[PDB]
Amino acid sequence: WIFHALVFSYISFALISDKRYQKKEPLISSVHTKVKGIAEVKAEILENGMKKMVSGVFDTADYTFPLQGNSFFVMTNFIKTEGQQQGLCPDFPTARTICSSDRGCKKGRMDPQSKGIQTGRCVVYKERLKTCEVSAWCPIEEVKDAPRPALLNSAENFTVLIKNNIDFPGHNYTTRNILPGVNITCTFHKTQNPQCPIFRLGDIFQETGDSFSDVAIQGGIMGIEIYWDCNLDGWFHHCRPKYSFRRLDDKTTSESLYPGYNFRYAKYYKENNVEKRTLIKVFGIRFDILVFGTGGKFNVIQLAVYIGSVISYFGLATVFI
Amino acid sequence: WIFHALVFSYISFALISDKRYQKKEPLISSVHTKVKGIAEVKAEILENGMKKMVSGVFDTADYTFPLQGNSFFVMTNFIKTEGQQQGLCPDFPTARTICSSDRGCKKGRMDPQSKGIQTGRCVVYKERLKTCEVSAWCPIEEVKDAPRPALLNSAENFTVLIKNNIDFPGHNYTTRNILPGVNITCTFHKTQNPQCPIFRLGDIFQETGDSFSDVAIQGGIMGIEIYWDCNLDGWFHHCRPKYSFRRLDDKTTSESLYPGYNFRYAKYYKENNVEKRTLIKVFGIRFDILVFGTGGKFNVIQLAVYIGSVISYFGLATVFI
Amino acid sequence: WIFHALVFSYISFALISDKRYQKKEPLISSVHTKVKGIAEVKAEILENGMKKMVSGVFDTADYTFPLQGNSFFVMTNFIKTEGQQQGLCPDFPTARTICSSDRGCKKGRMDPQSKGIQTGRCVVYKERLKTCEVSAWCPIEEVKDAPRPALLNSAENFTVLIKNNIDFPGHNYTTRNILPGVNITCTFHKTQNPQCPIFRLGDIFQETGDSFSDVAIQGGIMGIEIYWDCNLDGWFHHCRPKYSFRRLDDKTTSESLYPGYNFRYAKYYKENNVEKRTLIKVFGIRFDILVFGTGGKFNVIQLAVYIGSVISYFGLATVFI
Ligand SMILES: O=C(NCC1(N2CCN(c3ccccc3)CC2)CCOCC1)c1cccnc1Sc1ccccc1
Numbered sequence: 001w002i003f004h005a006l007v008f009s010y011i012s013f014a015l016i017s018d019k020r021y022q023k024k025e026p027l028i029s030s031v032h033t034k035v036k037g038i039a040e041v042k043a044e045i046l047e048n049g050m051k052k053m054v055s056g057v058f059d060t061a062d063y064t065f066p067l068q069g070n071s072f073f074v075m076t077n078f079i080k081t082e083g084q085q086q087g088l089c090p091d092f093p094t095a096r097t098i099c100s101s102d103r104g105c106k107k108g109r110m111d112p113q114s115k116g117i118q119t120g121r122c123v124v125y126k127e128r129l130k131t132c133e134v135s136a137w138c139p140i141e142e143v144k145d146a147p148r149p150a151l152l153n154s155a156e157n158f159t160v161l162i163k164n165n166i167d168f169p170g171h172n173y174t175t176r177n178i179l180p181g182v183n184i185t186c187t188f189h190k191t192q193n194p195q196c197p198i199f200r201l202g203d204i205f206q207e208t209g210d211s212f213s214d215v216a217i218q219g220g221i222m223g224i225e226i227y228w229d230c231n232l233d234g235w236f237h238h239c240r241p242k243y244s245f246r247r248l249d250d251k252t253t254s255e256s257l258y259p260g261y262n263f264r265y266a267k268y269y270k271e272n273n274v275e276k277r278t279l280i281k282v283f284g285i286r287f288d289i290l291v292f293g294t295g296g297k298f299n300v301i302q303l304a305v306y307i308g309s310v311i312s313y314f315g316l317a318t319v320f321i
Numbered sequence: 322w323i324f325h326a327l328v329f330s331y332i333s334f335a336l337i338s339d340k341r342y343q344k345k346e347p348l349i350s351s352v353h354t355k356v357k358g359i360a361e362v363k364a365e366i367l368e369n370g371m372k373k374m375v376s377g378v379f380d381t382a383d384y385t386f387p388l389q390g391n392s393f394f395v396m397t398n399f400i401k402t403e404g405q406q407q408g409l410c411p412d413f414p415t416a417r418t419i420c421s422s423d424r425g426c427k428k429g430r431m432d433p434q435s436k437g438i439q440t441g442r443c444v445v446y447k448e449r450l451k452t453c454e455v456s457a458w459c460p461i462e463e464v465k466d467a468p469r470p471a472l473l474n475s476a477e478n479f480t481v482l483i484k485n486n487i488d489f490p491g492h493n494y495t496t497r498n499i500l501p502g503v504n505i506t507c508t509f510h511k512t513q514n515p516q517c518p519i520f521r522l523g524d525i526f527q528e529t530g531d532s533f534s535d536v537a538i539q540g541g542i543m544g545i546e547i548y549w550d551c552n553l554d555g556w557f558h559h560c561r562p563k564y565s566f567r568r569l570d571d572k573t574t575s576e577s578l579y580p581g582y583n584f585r586y587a588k589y590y591k592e593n594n595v596e597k598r599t600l601i602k603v604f605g606i607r608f609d610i611l612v613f614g615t616g617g618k619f620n621v622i623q624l625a626v627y628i629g630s631v632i633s634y635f636g637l638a639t640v641f642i
Numbered sequence: 643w644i645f646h647a648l649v650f651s652y653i654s655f656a657l658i659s660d661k662r663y664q665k666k667e668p669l670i671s672s673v674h675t676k677v678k679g680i681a682e683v684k685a686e687i688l689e690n691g692m693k694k695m696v697s698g699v700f701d702t703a704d705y706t707f708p709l710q711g712n713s714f715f716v717m718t719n720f721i722k723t724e725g726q727q728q729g730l731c732p733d734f735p736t737a738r739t740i741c742s743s744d745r746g747c748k749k750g751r752m753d754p755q756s757k758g759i760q761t762g763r764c765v766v767y768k769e770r771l772k773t774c775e776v777s778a779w780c781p782i783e784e785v786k787d788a789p790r791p792a793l794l795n796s797a798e799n800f801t802v803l804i805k806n807n808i809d810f811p812g813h814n815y816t817t818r819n820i821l822p823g824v825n826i827t828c829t830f831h832k833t834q835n836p837q838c839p840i841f842r843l844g845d846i847f848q849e850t851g852d853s854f855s856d857v858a859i860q861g862g863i864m865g866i867e868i869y870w871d872c873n874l875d876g877w878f879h880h881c882r883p884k885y886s887f888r889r890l891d892d893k894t895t896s897e898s899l900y901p902g903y904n905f906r907y908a909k910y911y912k913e914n915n916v917e918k919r920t921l922i923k924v925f926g927i928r929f930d931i932l933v934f935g936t937g938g939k940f941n942v943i944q945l946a947v948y949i950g951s952v953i954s955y956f957g958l959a960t961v962f963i
Pocket residue numbers: 055056057058061062063064065066075078080265280282407586587589596
């Protein structure tokens with residue numbers, strides 16, 4: 001009766017809306033990014049208790065790294081420990097490193113917080129303050145915070161140009177993030193330019209509602225999501241990206257869980273016939289470009305199997321009344 | 322009647338062909354590549370208007386980068402700007418950089434095309450030609466094209482050895498790209514050696530129909546696809562790779578969309594007690610190894626559910642006549 | 643009759659166990675690792691036939707590389723060829739390089755085993771032993787084995803801290819590897835600490851049953867699997883990682899298939915106004931963090947379609963008797 005027409009209607013609807021006539025294949029993604037922008041570093045940092053003038057112009061080669069694994073990194077802050085060489089030196093004053101006597105130092109001791117192996121001697125670091133002498137790259141990098149305003153704070157004004165190429169192998173269909181002939185000069189805006197592949201980093205942090213400066217002080221991990229909802233039927237054809245932004249780092253703020261994003265980068269060189277090293281603690285934001293999607297095209301066997309689930313609601317819907 | 326036997330036959334066929342008795346799980350891929358080959362660079366390049374002799378032998382450490390994220394890079398061309406140091410200098414003559422007077426330069430101006438921050442002064446670059454003086458790594462890298470024949474043109478003769486390891490966790494089945502005891506000495510050929518994991522790069526560009534030289538001049542992004550169609554039933558067992566090749570870069574040829582593949586690599590050093598930098602614009606092909614596949618093994622619940630869609634064509638096929 | 647209740651029971655069971663009422667979406671993973679530990683290298687290596695003292699303290703910046711593509715590398719051994727410069731030199735004595743006369747050397751010949759291009763001359767390498775003179779980075783790196791105990795053998799005591807963030811976009815559900823407030827100080831143990839994100843590398847090799855020392859001599863590729871079985875219904879809620887460990891390298895032990903894991907890292911520098919290079923053959927373990935999983939939440943259309951397969955066993959189960 002009428003309930004049968006409503007069962008046919010709701011069933012065929014669930015078919016249409018849920019695209020069950022379609023077979024759905026996962027996508028294959030390739031990413032290629034070009035980061036643009038420079039930054040001028042004028043700041044006053046404190047090195048070893050003394051004030052020091054940090055200046056210099058930073059371009060692409062000085063703060064970024066080519067995209068490896070659908071992700072790129074933009075340095076936003078740094079601490080620089082210059083002139084290190086293999087030797088013996090008192091470890092940096094810390095609750096774990098301070099020693100009253102040689103009894104507080106055990107030869108061969110290693111500590112997660114330290115970067116050296118103890119010799120077993122208690123030596124003076126400054127004045128009457130004593131720390132356990134270690135063998136390491138000397139002098140030891142100080143335990144301090146990253147610069148109070150991030151040295152490369154201007155990075156929010158930088159631009160990332162993203163090129164995404166997706167392919168569905170089963171359906172033999174290839175398409176790319178940028179269709180031909182589009183006006184490339186634009187900034188991505190949620191509404192004004194939803195297809196602009198040019199992203200201002202500050203814009204991204206506003207979309208996720210995080211402040212770029214705060215994250216820039218100690219680093220973070222941001223996420224650029226490129227969603228691909230795709231239809232390959234022709235009766236309704238659509239297959240373009242949807243750009244969303246999600247902040248990926250944990251924001252723990254606990255010294256035990258290593259917050260932010262940073263890494264220790266070495267620059268080796270020789271000086272006065274001695275092996276030497278300039279260690280730079282590098283702070284910045286890692287952007288992770290996550291491309292996910294599904295491509296649909298009608299399958300007879302799928303539409304069949306669905307019908308086979310559906311005739312049982314024809315008959316069973318008849319048996320209900 | 323006969324239509325019922327044809328419905329059972331077409332249904333059970335769709336089962337067999339579409340492997341619907343089988344549950345299908347996605348694969349997990351690990352890649353490990355070893356690139357072999359060297360190249361001799363004898364060429365004459367033009368630096369700052371003057372001819373210069375570019376020579377040298379390039380081995381693995383000089384042109385490639387270990388595989389990060391199922392992809393490896395092979396440099397094929399380069400422009401080298403040596404001796405840069407932080408300072409002030411006239412920007413390179415360009416439609417956007419040429420100034421008639423100090424009125425064309427605004428102090429603090431930054432430009433996507435430039436690598437510096439303007440001081441607000443109009444200075445001479447050469448002769449009577451004036452550009453806006455900038456603060457940057459000086460001298461500025463010239464605006465020129467990459468060498469006319471690619472300096473590392475020999476890269477087409479290089480070899481990539483690919484090692485792929487796939488695992489299906491649900492089915493607890495692990496297999497690798499190279500089965501034991503195979504004659505490793507071979508070049509992959511579509512027909513003569515379809516299982517050779519040794520790929521000549523030129524061969525790859527011929528398969529995709531792109532010329533290796535052209536792409537090598539300004540760089541590109543190529544794609545090595547490893548398809549895994551796999552059957553874990555035993556009645557029919559097959560699970561080997563299918564190597565296909567697809568060119569991934571967009572081939573735009575528009576100065577606004579940054580064509581090819583290149584990146585700006587810095588080499589820092591100290592000289593005459595001055596912080597100095599040799600900037601190399603690096604051109605090459607990025608190879609993206611895309612491993613996709615599906616592993617099938619018969620599922621009772623799946624075969625069931627399919628039968629449950631199928632009995633409705635038994636009965637409904639009876640009701641049709 | 644009773645067989646109908648057993649068909650309803652086995653069917654509804656297959657529903658419950660196989661979670662067919664649930665729609666299942668694949669996960670999105672982001673990884674962030676921090677490696678901790680240092681190593682002291684005291685060893686005696688043989689360079690060019692003469693004994694040499696290898697010593698030095700190695701920290702994070704000296705042996706690891708930030709996580710690129712859900713994978714990180716820990717160097718465990720190395721051979722160091724210092725002072726190389728572009729020139730001519732006899733290739734290293736090898737079955738393929740040894741020449742009786744200039745007839746054994748062809749000008750322009752390149753060989754997979756060699757790192758140079760032959761000049762076509764047969765010269766003395768040592769004493770009366772002759773090899774084919776090549777143009778390359780000179781002197782050529784010796785053909786030898788990696789140090790007999792791995793120089794960075796202590797790497798098994800190192801620690802990897804893994805931070806995984808997964809997201810299901812369709813279900814709008816985000817969760818991370820580390821829930822808040824957990825006691826971070828711990829070592830992952832299969833039973834004692836199944837949720838500890840802190841992994842000792844030696845522990846990992848014991849779990850996979852490989853010896854860390856052996857692999858550390860010539861390198862390897864290990865696999866850290868993070869499985870995510872997840873339920874988003876609330877009636878039964880569970881969504882945590884399962885850490886498993888699988889050794890990914892092929893363990894071929896054949897000189898033709900490049901066993902282990904190693905790469906040739908160049909350190910360029912200038913000396914006596916000559917372009918020079920220190921080549922280091924780097925041996926270590928690459929860890930591949932493989933995050934896979936599935937998130938389930940009940941779907942009306944799915945539960946429907948299943949019922950539609952099921953009523954045909956109601957009726958067909960009736961027709962069987
Ligand atoms: O040197 C500095 N940064 C260089 C970094 N590079 C990037 C490019 N890498 C790279 C490597 C291989 C292939 C391709 C690319 C290398 C490493 C370091 C890691 O983080 C990103 C940038 C640095 C930091 C802090 C203050 N200064 C300066 S250099 C400087 C000196 C004087 C004036 C201005 C800048």
